[PDB]
Chain A
């Protein structure tokens, strides 16, 4: 009946706007930084300077005489067996990918992958089967261990 107000998305005019914004930001940074940067006899004769240098040389000669709280572990607490210790390493993530670092054991992940593969080879709150697609067993460390 009546369309609601929509701003036209121009992919390449937005680039011009971004470039103008970047130029304005650079100019503002230059103006701000020049204030912090623009704040800063013996200059015309040499014999006086050499006398001062010799005096300073004489002066120098005279003076000659453990805690990892908050680090998630992407494994169930029950996965770890008493009586032995085992090593955790960081899971691979992209550098630009802004996300929390998780601690991972390669052997435990291999075991979980094998379990998932076994389950999928034998299986042949709303709409659960496709909830995994749109969207995990981790615990948070506190003052070291938990």
Chain B
């Protein structure tokens, strides 16, 4: 809720969140930190059809 640029908090939150909410949080983190290639890769891991 303090909007941290750290990916570790986002990574910890995503791994225990619902997959749809997980990808939404990953998109929010990407908006906060575009350089976070891990979040983009995780979102691409759930890119669907």
Residues in chain A within 8 A of chain B (CB atoms) = 46-47, 50, 52-54, 56-57, 60
Contacts and interface: CB of A to CB of B under 8 A. Distances in A.
Interface string B1-38: 10100000000000001100100110010011000000
Interface residues of B, number: 10
B32 A46 contact: no
Contacts, number: 23
Contact of A57 (B17, B21, B25, B32): B32
Interface of B: 1, 3, 17-18, 21, 24-25, 28, 31-32
Nearest to B2: A56
Given A47-B24, A56-B3, 19 more contacts: A46-B17, A46-B21, A46-B24, A46-B25, A47-B21, A50-B21, A50-B24, A50-B25, A50-B28, A53-B1, A53-B3, A53-B28, A54-B28, A56-B1, A57-B3, A57-B28, A57-B31, A57-B32, A60-B3
A39 B45 CA distance: 44
22 contacts: A46-B17, A46-B18, A46-B21, A46-B24, A46-B25, A47-B21, A47-B24, A50-B21, A50-B24, A50-B25, A50-B28, A52-B1, A53-B1, A53-B3, A53-B28, A54-B28, A56-B1, A56-B3, A57-B3, A57-B28, A57-B31, A57-B32
